[PDB]
Amino acid sequence: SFKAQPFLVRNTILCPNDKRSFTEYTQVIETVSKNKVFLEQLLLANPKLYDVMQKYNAGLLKKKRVKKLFESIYKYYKRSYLRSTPFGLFSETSIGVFSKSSQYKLMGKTTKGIRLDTQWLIRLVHKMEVDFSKKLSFTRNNANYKFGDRVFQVYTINSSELEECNIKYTNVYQIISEFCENDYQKYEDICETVTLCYGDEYRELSEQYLGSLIVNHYLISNLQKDLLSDFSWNTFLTKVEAIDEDKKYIIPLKKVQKFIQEYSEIEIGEGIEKLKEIYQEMSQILENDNYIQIDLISDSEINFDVKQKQQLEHLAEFLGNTTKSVRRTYLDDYKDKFIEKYGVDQEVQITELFDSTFGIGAPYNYNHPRNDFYESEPSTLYYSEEEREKYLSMYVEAVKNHNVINLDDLESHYQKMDLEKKSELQGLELFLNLAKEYEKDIFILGDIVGNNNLGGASGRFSALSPELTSYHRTIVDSVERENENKEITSCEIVFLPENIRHANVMHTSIMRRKVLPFFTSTSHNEVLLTNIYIGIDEKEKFYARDISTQEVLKFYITSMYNKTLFSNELRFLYEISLDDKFGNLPWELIYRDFDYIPRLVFDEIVISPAKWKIWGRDVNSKMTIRELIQSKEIPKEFYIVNGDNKVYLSQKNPLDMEILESAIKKSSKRKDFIELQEYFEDENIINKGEKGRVADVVVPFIRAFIREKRVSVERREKLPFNEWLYLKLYISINRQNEFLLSYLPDIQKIVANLGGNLFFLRYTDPKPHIRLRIKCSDLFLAYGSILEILKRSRKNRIMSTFDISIYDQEVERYGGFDTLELSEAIFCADSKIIPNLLTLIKDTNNDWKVDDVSILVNYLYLKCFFQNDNKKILNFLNLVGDQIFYDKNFKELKHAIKNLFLKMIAQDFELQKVYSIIDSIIHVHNNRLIGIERDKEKLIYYTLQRLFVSEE
């Protein structure tokens, strides 16, 4: 069902058949320092490091800096030959296709895709924003958001540091910000708008206050419009020129554009001095540790077999199938927290949602910021207990037998599972390394593996050529067409990273309808952060909606930017926008702590290479590092895995053994371990001058929303002793019924004399208690009078404590404050009858017991709401003992119901609004009469279904 798209092919420039071996570190500096290609590769990728090498060769480098210089150069050398991952001048990106025969050979021609370093560029514009503010115009940073008397940002920048900063919401912030909320406004008019309702006396302060917003990036200048998303030398230069009267910046900038254009046609090896010129003209303007990024594209076209295509599609299905066993994620627990705080009827402003003092904070696994109240880890279930026994069983036998682990064993388990549920997953990107074993070509799955973010691996390369833009457009038009069916507005999050070093990762082309920007601005239609509201589907699924247009939103980050790095709210918007189950493969999770893991394989694919964990503590005086790794039967060629990258080593090469001894002694310092992986021969598959290249590939594969905007706390919260008084009475479950018999009616009698009315509820969490809510006109006097009854229940050890709490009304659930109040009259009437029903259930002269009263009362409710019309009653029911009727309390309840029923008719409530509200009112009756119990509430409806049919 998964179809393998045309893929990206990534390969080295240099060829590993030309790799030289080495025995000494000085020998490596000697060779490398007259290797024309290497030094251009080094000067471009790692300027600072390249200069340290110069410094050493000149004798100017301090001794303590030398081991690091030696190791970094050796590792960078290995990499320019052995590591195909695409990065400027080491390796190149091309497009590959599926045909009838494999074509592992590159006829194409290599070209340099060249951007400015993005940290350099932004750091310049920020310098222009302060120097030239009086000649610029400004807009509001979408990152800003009001919160009480403060203005916050979803993240912070200028303090070149790591600390968050917020400002006061002043009258002057209000004027300035609302004035710039939708367009750009000239410095002078911003200043004018302030003085025009303060006085010209204040023009000093206005300018200062305005400048301080600009330093702290509460405002964005027009130099930043499209500056990170679609940069144009024309548009940029003409605004700088318009700004720069003393020609300080234009001309060097024109020279830089020239020198880069000249650099574009030079070969790889020959441009060292042209590059030196670029760095020189750019370092004069403003210094930065990097000045240029290059992505090398080719126009070659690698081909794969029809069998190969089938092998990959087979692998995609197996991997996607395992997500079938992900029953409860960290985000599911968050959905539950959501529903407990908000119910299902509210939509919540996203910045209110994630507030840990006023909302529910974040998913347990979010760290920006981590929750600042304590909470223990929730239950998750990413695989079953049966699955885990199989995996451990598979693990134990493979180690006992010196075998690999064939995941094939469970392929028929996972494809079989849940053939009923319609799989959510739209597609996959997979990352694969090409190698060989026993002269046969094999695929090896990257340790990154892949993801379900379609177009993520190609978005960076989209703009660099038309063929690439076409490619990317195809990949994401399978998502955009489906968004269009479902009437969902897609939306790219476009942002300056919080740590601006990472600013070159964020690049992609905007293929969506709208844009959500932060610390930048574009020309697209843009969503306001504080217009995003979160709710819950008919299927208890998180969705996002723009409160100004009522559009439903899905958000995208079509790049390889680490998603766990974001501010919680942005990470959340991203995560609710795809299908939350791909991610945690069971073998990764279950085998994680073993220090030897066999190779994992699946249908000739190497899912995961053999993996070791070597421990610092094990290198002993009776044991060096080389018989340690020999005591663990480490192959003669292996990788040491650092993080992002890995370093090739051989036991035969003594330099490789020095790097390892270095590695092992660093970890003996922290008292942890290093990670070794087995080596695959990977050099002579793809080729060029019939010389191999190291290669890898990236294959892609292919309602009636009600809900109401949440009501403010000012309107929903009822404060103690104003209109209501609300007590939590901490009474055990076994004694609540006794309290409801022998104490509550003395409390009801009291509040009656004072002309009021009360309703109660049973609630656990934290500990079990009864929520007593009294509405009455002299509440301090009613508190006084019932305090005697409560003391009596403390003495008899039925209640331990009480609190007086804020009554948070459920306005949205019960239909607005009008139908809410009528619901509350139903609550209080239901509460008057309960002690009498309990006394009938308790008396044995009766021989009616608790389940008889429950179906009966439930029967009378339905007879009230639908006015004895049995056919309507069964309408409601399909979709989910005479003296109580002549009881005076029940007559009062029956009026309370007629009155709610009338107002719902008056205000034209859609009918499912009425069905949900009657379900709620019957739900809290059951709470009151019997347990806080799940589903035994629901099976009452089933038997009432039977009794009503019989009336006919």
Binding site: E164, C165, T170
Partner: peptide, 16 residues
Amino acid sequence: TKDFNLDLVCVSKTXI
């Protein structure tokens, strides 16, 4: 008045 402040504040990252 002095609602031109700004009041920038920045933050980092018992009993018994």
